[PDB]
Amino acid sequence: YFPLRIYEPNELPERSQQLTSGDLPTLYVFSTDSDARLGLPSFNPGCLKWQTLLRLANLDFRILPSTNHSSPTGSLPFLLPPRTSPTASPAPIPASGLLSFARDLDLGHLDADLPPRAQAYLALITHSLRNAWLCALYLDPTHDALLRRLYVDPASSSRAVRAALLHQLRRAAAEQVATASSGGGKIVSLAPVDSADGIDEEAVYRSARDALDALASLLRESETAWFGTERPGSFDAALFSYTHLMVEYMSEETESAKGRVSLGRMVKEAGNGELAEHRERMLGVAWPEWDGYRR
Amino acid sequence: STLEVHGATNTRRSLLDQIFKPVLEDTTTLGQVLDRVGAATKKLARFDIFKEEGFGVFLSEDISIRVKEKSRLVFSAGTDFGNAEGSAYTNAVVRNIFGGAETLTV
Amino acid sequence: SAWSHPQFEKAVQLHVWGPAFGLPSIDAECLAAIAYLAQTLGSADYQLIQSSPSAVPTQHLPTLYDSRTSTWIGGFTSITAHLHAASATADGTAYTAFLSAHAAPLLALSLYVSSANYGAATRPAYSAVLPLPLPWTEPPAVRAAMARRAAHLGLSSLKSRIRLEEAAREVLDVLAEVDWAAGGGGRQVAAEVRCLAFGYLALMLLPDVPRPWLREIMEGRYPALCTFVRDFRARVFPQGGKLLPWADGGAQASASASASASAVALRFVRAVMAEVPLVGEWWSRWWTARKKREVLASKGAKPAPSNDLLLLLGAGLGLTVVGAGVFFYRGLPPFGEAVQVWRKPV
Amino acid sequence: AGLGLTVVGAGVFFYRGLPPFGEAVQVWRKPV
Amino acid sequence: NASTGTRTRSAYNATFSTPINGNPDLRLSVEALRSATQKPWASHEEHLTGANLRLAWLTEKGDTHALAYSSVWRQLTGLAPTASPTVRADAGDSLKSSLTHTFTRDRRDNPMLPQSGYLFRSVSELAGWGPLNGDVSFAKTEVEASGALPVAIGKSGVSVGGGLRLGVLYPLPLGYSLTGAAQPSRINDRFQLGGPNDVRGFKIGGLGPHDGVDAVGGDVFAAGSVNALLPLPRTGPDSPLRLQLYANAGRLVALNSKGTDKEGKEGLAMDSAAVFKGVKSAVGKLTNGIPSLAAGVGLVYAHPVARFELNFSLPLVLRRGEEGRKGLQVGVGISFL
Predict the structure, then answer these.
(1) For a surface tag, which of A272, C83, E58, E104 has the fewest beta carbons within 10 Å of its beta carbon?
(2) Domain containing residue E220
(3) Nearest CA of chain D to the CA of B45: how many Å?
C-alpha cells in the first residue's frame, strides 16, 4: 500500500553469475582449478571420503574448489543445491547431510551401523592413519613444496600472508597430532602442545605401519573383494580417502639417505598388497574413466 | 545427607573442609541440623573470602550453599581520618592468594 | 624450525604416578604399564620410580629408563614396543587404537570434567603424590589436557544424563565382546592389550566419585567387565599393590631421588614461567625443543646442534615490550630550556 | 638483574596469580 | 582500542604522526590497524590486519588533501547463518595494496547543520596495478557535492538543502597496462547504499542487488537529496534542534558482462572491451527508470561533535527486495546525505 512501484530486481554482479550459476548440485572440496573441471579426486582426505561416497551414490554433481571459510560449519566439504531463482537459492547441505540429499537402487549400504568389531577397526583409520598423514604432510620438511602449492599458494598470492597461512596450518596440525596418545601425550603448561617438539614421530610412524598391517589382515578374510560386503560402503570409502592420497602424493621413489620408508610404499607393500588392489578396484567403480594415477 | 558449596571457585578445598566436615557429624532432630548449618555458614563469613549479599542455603529432599567470591584485586585513593586533618593514600589489596590470605600495600 | 621434524648429523626404571585410588597408580596409561611390567619381567628387574611430568625429559609420564643403554622411552605403546592366527595381533592393534581414543575421553568425563568428581576424588589424589608447591601447577595442567581430550563428545560439566549414558554405552558395547580375561569365549587378543584394557576399565569403575554414573552403568549393564577388573586386580595387585618393587621404601620414598628443594623449586619456577603470555609461550616452545633433543640424544641419534631462535624471539618480544613501555613512559631528557633567546645579527 | 626480575616476577605473580584453587561445585557426604 | 555494542569487536592502530619540514599543516602518519568488524547486512565478518602510511596536507584556503598507501588482509570468516551463495563464493583472503587521494573543500557555516554553506569532497583509489601488487585491481572513484541556502524570513534559518553523490568501480588488469584480462569485483570492494545516513527510509543495507536477505554491493551508484530544514515553528532561531523535510533518491547497479559469449570458460576474466561495455551499460541502466524515493519529517539536533535525527520516513518507490523501512528511522553520525 505504501510503496508505489516495483522495478524488476537488481541483477546480481558478475562474480555471482560466473560462479554460483549452476545446473547440478555443487560440492565444495579442497581441489584445484585444473582438476575440478574433470571431477578428479580432491587432495584432502576429509573431502575425498565424501566425494567417493557421493560418486558411489550415483549422484550427478559438480566439484568446485573452496577454502574452508565458506562452510555452514567449520570444515569444508559441504554441498549447495542448484539455484532455483536468479536471486535466491536453497540452504547449504553440511557434510553430514550429503547422503540424505543423495536420495537410486539402495542408499543403505553407504550409511549403516557398523558391527562392533568394525567400530574398533575404524579407529585405525580415523586416528592412526590420520595422525600419520598430518605429521607426514604438515610437519615434514620434504613436503614443504606440496603443502605450499596445495594449501597456501592458491590462497593469497602474497608472501607476507602466505607465511602466516603456512604458520597457522602447521600449528593447527601439530595441535592435533599432539593429542592422540599414539605419538604425543606430553604435559606442559595449560596450553596444547602446538609444535613438532611434542609430537614424537617414530611412535606415529610405527602406529601407522601397524594400522596398515591390521587393515590388510582384515581385508584378507572378506572373500568378496571389499570389507565384508558386495559393494563398497562407508568403510571402503573411509580407507580409500587415505590410501589413495598416500599413494599419490607421498610415494617418493631419497628414502635410503633418511630411512623411514614413505607412507605410499607402506601402503603398496602392506601385507600382500591387498590395500593397493583395493584402492585400484575403487578407482574403477567411482572413477571408471580416469587414467594416470599411481603418481 | 549431602551438602554442596556452589560458587567458591578460588577457595581451597581443605579450608571449606575444616569448616564443613564436622557439620556432617550430626548423626530427625531438624533443629540441631539447622543450628549447625547456621553456625557453619556464620563461621564461613568471619573470613574475608567472599561477599555477604548471597549466602543462600537451600533445603530439599539435601543442603546447597551458594557463595560468590568477593574479588582478587582492589585499588583505592580515599582519604584517611587517622587523627589528622587529612591523608591521601593508595591502598592496593589482594583479597585472596592461596587460601584465606591477604596482601595490602598503603 | 620448531614446527618440523628434527635434523640429524651426517634393570629398567618405570616412572609412574602415585597410587591414589587403591590401585598402583592413576592415569590408566601408567597403571597399564605397571600391570604389564609386573606380569613379564619379575620383581628383580624393574624399580617403579614415582615421578611427575616435570621430573623426566620425555614430559610424558609412562616413561621407562633402560639402564644399559640409558635410553628414555615415553608412552605405553612405545614401552611395550621396547621390552619385546594373525587376527589375534590385528585385533590387538585395533582395540589398542580404540582404547587410546574413545575410552580416554570417557574416563576423562568422570574424574576430570565433572567438577564434582575433580576436587572431591581426583584433585586430592593428585596432591597426595606431589611435592608440596607442585599441586598448584601440575594438577590443573593435567585437568586441562584431559578436558581438551574429552572434547568432541559435546559434553561438559552439565535430563542431560541419558546422554552421558548413551555416550558410555557406545563405547562399552564395543569393549564388551573381547573376552578380556579367559581361556575361552569371544576374541582373545593379547596380553599387552589386556593390560591396557584393565588400566582404563579399573580407573573407570573403582574410584569413589561423588557422582558415579560410570560405575553405575558398568556394574548394571556390563558384569563381564566388572568381573574381569576384579579378578585381574586380585591376581596381579594383591594387597593394594604394595608388593610391587617400588624404590627404596615404597611409593612416597620414591619421590626422594629427584625431589630435593632445589629441583622442586626449579620445576615450580618453570611451570609458572610458562604462564606469562608471550615470553611464556615462547619459553615453553624452546624448553620442549631442548628436552626433545635431549631425549633423542639419549636414544642414540645425533640431532642438529641447537637453534636458540625461539628463546631469542621470546626474549626479544619481552625486552622490546618493556623497552618501548619505559621509553614512552619516562622518555628522554627534555629537548628544550625554560628560556630561549633570539637576537638579530649585525 | 635480581632486583628487576624479582620486581617483575612479584608483579606478575600477584596480578595474574596461580590457577584457581577450588571448583564451581564441591560435594561432601557422610561416610558409612 | 574501540569496541562497539553492535558491530565492531576490536581495534588497535597506534597512529604515529610527525610534522614534515617544520610545517604544522603538512603531516605524516604511520598507522598499524587490527580490527574485526561485523557486517550483518551481508552476513559475514571482516578481519583487517594491515598498516597504512598517510600524508595529509591542509592548505591555507581551508581545503585539505591526503595521499595514503594502505596494505591490508581482509579475511571474511563469519558465515555462521544461512547467508548466500554469493557471500560464500567470496569466501575470503586478500591483500589490496592501494593508493588513495581525498580532497575536502569545506565551506559550510556549520559542519553538523549547514545553512549557508557548500561542500565538495572527492575520494579516488587505485588498488593493485603496476607497482602495487596484491589480489584486487580496480580504480574506485567517489564524488560528493552539497549545499545549503536560506531565502527569506534577523536570521531565521529556512536553509533549503541539497546533495549529490556518485561513484564508479572499474576493474583493471594486474600489471603496467590499461588493456588486459581484469577480474570482477568482490563483496569486499563494492559499494553499499542506504540506511540512516546515505538514503533514509531504508535498512542499513538496502538499495542494491540482493541474493536473498543478503545485501551484495554494486559498482556504479548515484544518490541524491533535497531538504527544507525549517526552523522550530513560531519560536525563531533557537537551539540546534530544528525541523527537517526531505526527499531522497538512490541507485546502485552492478557490473555484468552479458555482452560477450566468446569468454565462456574462465568467467572471472574480462577483456578490456567487455569491461568497458559493462560499465557503459551499467551507467545506462542507472540513467533510465525512476531511481528510488523516500520522504518524511525529522528532528535534527546538531550536537557539537555529532548529529541526531530520530526521523519518520515512508519509502515511495523501490526495487524487488530492497528492504525499505518505515518505523522511526533513528539516525546518528557525522556524515549525512
Answers:
(1) A272
(2) 1-317
(3) 17
